[PDB]
Symmetry: D2
Subunit: 255 residues, 4 copies
């Protein structure tokens, strides 16, 4: 009997670090991704990553039911939520641009917890992890849609911890920034963030560790939280951003 | 000339405290409310509060447009947002119950700012105030929809402050709890909160001031922020909750 | 006729607090290190005939002197200052942190410790600390000053929980980029309004792209001390103009 | 090659969980304690815990120097700081009661980092962990000294992360509450917190997981952070408090 995890949007953001490290820790890892609606994309992923179990199901209720049918139960949920950040002055958005952000970044993790929480509560075990964003900690101007939706997700995780603790289910939010996402455009691909001088310099300026975060670092945190080694952190919002933000110092002070 | 303010949902939550004090400060206060769809309700309100200017418009763009047409411009927006709090374990909600909360508590203030920001930015003046909630500061268990949507609104306000400051527009969020709402059910009506002993005792336990907050206190803060006397607070989330939460102390320690 | 105390009145948030509290009708007893000298006290008294400078320096003696002269202390504005010294952590002396915590934590604690009994007995009073917004977004190499200010913020918030039962609100106002006119604590006119590089820095790091004014600080102090919005008790106010502005990605405009 | 850790006040608070788990992870763990001034107490500890290395040094600079001399360097500092919480109304404290709290809970971790940072910066490696408190997250009334000093330490850790990241040195604060401390009075000994029904009931009410945190959970987090597996969390303040605080709900709602 292996523990079963679900990682959503596995090709993007914190998906690969989460899935790879959870598998290394002995989980069966069912993986969701928009591309897995296509048989060829699902099978290519299954061939490259024989330790992972890509699923074709897209919608929350269908995904939870399919993983429960295939593997018995869902022990760990990693809601690795993504949406394209679009920078606009507030008056240049359409209201639908905010609705799109809240559907992808708040309603979707809510729907996944809504669909899985009953089976976890009945057996009094489970772990729920949202991958959110550190942007609420220090917003950039002109990203009001994405940034506020991510904060809704952070508070959703914290609020859920208060009710699910009675059932021995920890709930966590991991909010990254400057997390290297390799080939994925969500949100710091190798090109340009490791390849272009202006981007390399920006990352050195705005993070304390002066580098991007790695998929391994994100995955190590995900597997540590899912292990049951430190459930007493339930309710935490983790800022996985390398010491971002670095705050501009007065004139004359060095870099 | 007169400064013009908009107070939404004026019959509820922080509506009357805001509208009455803004009018005392010399604003023309255009008032929105769902009941003003009915001519008899609008006219009854106008007769009781002849210093206030109730509008029939319901949707955010049409409300901004109607106030702008009637009075020239909108100087102060008070987005007094409401939604009925419904307590449920996460798995007992419908997903639509979260969508309803986000629409009412996040999308609506976004849409109002989206509709009014251009006119404020063009003249480089204006004030934006969201009435949100202090529940994200200390969530109750089983209120995950309402609580997380309110946090999204708080971050929306803070994020907007970063872009609108360049146009001399402060943005504030006032997050109440235990605010006496008189005859309004949103969220602490006189009955039961001043009349039933168990409720009086609860409020004495969980607030530092051991009382409900008053509409006058809320209105004083709204008019102070709208006055242009302290624009340098832009980006603040105010916790208007009387020292809530009081945290349960160890056995043997007194009330 | 309500009585206020404003400490370190020549510096930081002192003048804005004292001037606006007097405009609101308070008798404003003013403390300052320079008032140990009669000539400096009397010059201040002549320039500001609406203010009442005191010579007393230590917390117990100051509270006692104001209570004797004016009956009671209704409003305490602990306007605390210390010179920010930037060092790598290993280049400080431990005494440099001790000095910061004495000036920025122990001192407001001692003033509340000295005045709280009289406020509690009559169930009225207002306590305001002027602290700092540096904990909200620390600069590197200011660990002493920044962490002491955070201690003061939590002290205010913790005190609100016990003093609310006695109808005494407690607030912390944490500024940054507050114009301090001729005081070096912490943004004097020269260089912050006069040197182009400093003007440009303020435009970059605040959302309102300017220093905050003494009038804005004083308006908040008088508003809180008025009893018009006691239900904010426990608040830490970030009076920093939308600071911090967070550096955006390459190619995005200023 | 063996990494070297220092755990202070090892007999108390998070001392044993930290030291035991770091030793299991392969660190040489030098241990400080006030009782180690006595040769008999140091030797008794060495006999019971032969995998740990108790030191007699008491003062911060002399402790760093003694561990560096004995083992070559200090790779991990765990500043496990303690002070007896004394509840008083603000006017009943002596000012010295606050000075004692700041000296023990702020000056002491500062002094330890001040003494060790140069050797870490020179080799561009090291980890700094403060064990602080979650009391600033939700203060009890009448504990203003201890609570505010702990907040100063949390900010000290966060501020230090901004400068030490350039040297590849993460800085963390772990702020517990309701951490079972076994035989130590700091701060939740087995008697009364597992033996007396009133105390057992209090813990069930005020934490989401309805139990004390374990030394194992604390030690797992300390060893995880010190492993270099997730340096990108630098600057984090961890709330290790089981979902504390639970916020009192309205009359009529169940516990
Ligand atoms: Cl990221
Ligand atoms: Cl309310
Ligand atoms: Cl004196
Ligand atoms: Cl300042
Ligand atoms: Cl503890
Ligand atoms: Na399939
Ligand atoms: Na009409
Ligand atoms: Na004198
Ligand atoms: Na020795």
């Amino acid at each position: 009997s292996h523990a079963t995890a679900i990682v959503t949007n596995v090709k993007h953001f914190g998906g690969m670090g989460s899935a790879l490290r959870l598998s290394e820790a002995g989980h069966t890892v069912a993986c969701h991704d928009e591309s897995f609606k296509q048989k060829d994309e699902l099978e290519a992923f299954a061939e490259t990553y024989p330790q992972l179990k890509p699923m074709s199901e897209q919608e929350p209720a269908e995904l939870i039911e399919a993983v429960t049918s295939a593997y018995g139960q869902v022990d760990v949920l990693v809601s690795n939520d993504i949406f394209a950040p679009e920078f606009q002055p507030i008056d240049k958005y359409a209201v639908e641009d905010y609705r799109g952000a809240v559907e992808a970044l708040q309603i979707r993790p809510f729907a996944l917890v809504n669909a899985v929480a009953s089976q976890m509560k009945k057996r009094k075990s489970g772990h729920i992890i949202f991958i959110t964003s550190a942007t609420p900690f220090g917003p950039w101007k002109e990203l009001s849609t994405y940034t506020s939706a991510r904060a809704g997700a952070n508070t959703l995780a914290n609020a859920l911890s208060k009710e699910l603790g009675e059932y021995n289910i920890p709930v966590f939010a991991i909010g990254p920034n400057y997390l290297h996402s390799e080939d994925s455009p969500y949100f710091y691909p190798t090109e340009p963030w490791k390849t272009n001088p202006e981007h390399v310099a920006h990352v050195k300026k705005v993070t304390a560790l002066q580098r991007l975060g790695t998929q391994k670092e994100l995955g190590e945190l995900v597997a540590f939280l899912a292990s049951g080694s430190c459930d007493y952190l339930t309710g935490q919002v983790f800022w996985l951003a390398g010491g971002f933000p670095m705050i501009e110092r007065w004139p004359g002070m060095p870099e």
